[PDB]
Amino acid sequence: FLEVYQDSIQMELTELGRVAEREDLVGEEKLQSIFFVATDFSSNPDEKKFFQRAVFYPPKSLFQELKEETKTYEQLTNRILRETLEKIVSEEALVRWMHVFYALLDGLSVEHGIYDETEFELRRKSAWAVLASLLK
Amino acid sequence: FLEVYQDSIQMELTELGRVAEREDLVGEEKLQSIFFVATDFSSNPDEKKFFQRAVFYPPKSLFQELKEETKTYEQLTNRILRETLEKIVSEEALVRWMHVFYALLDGLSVEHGIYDETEFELRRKSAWAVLASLLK
Which molecular-function annotations from GO does this UniProt entry contain (chains A, B) (predicted)? Predict the structure, then answer.
């Protein structure tokens, strides 16, 4: 199981990394690209579901095991966001943006399960528009 | 079960209705007030956990049952948001704000489970600050 989680984490990190290493993007574009990778819930839907359960509702049994490597995935996603954000906004704006990024990601993740694809995509676009509004 | 759900829905709608009937607040304050009721995940923790399971991950057995009831609760909370928003922003801004409101509510709901109280509250305040930024 815990290797199936490391299976999910590593795949996500490598898609995010692929976006993050591109140098021909402004930050807001780089951030848009990252947000859309993180919210693409229909690609590897099982990976995405597993990951969702491992994070939001871990088994109390394995609870301490995957909390540490959930924390690891977080620290790595945070570096990518912070290195992009710190170039275009202040620290106080950066922290607020990151908090909202994760809340929208988590909310969309759940919503993906109860809305059809068309409604989901509209929601996903509202969320990115509001994130973009914070970057000017 | 469906009695326990209508239990939870009813209590939430009653608490939201209380805030909504007040006439001494501007829309923003009214919406802030509504956002804080909706995100107060601490006050009836079990009610709030039940409600989450019912909405986000319903049992496939009772799935068509709970779906109609969940839709009912949504249309009622939508009326409160719409009553308030339509007075201060355009229809296209109103729709975007509502999409984001529910995505932040849902993500914070999730997050309440994995973060401690202090960290949760910071994220709840970032979420409301970004919602407020859309209202000027």
Answer: DNA-binding transcription factor activity; transcription cis-regulatory region binding
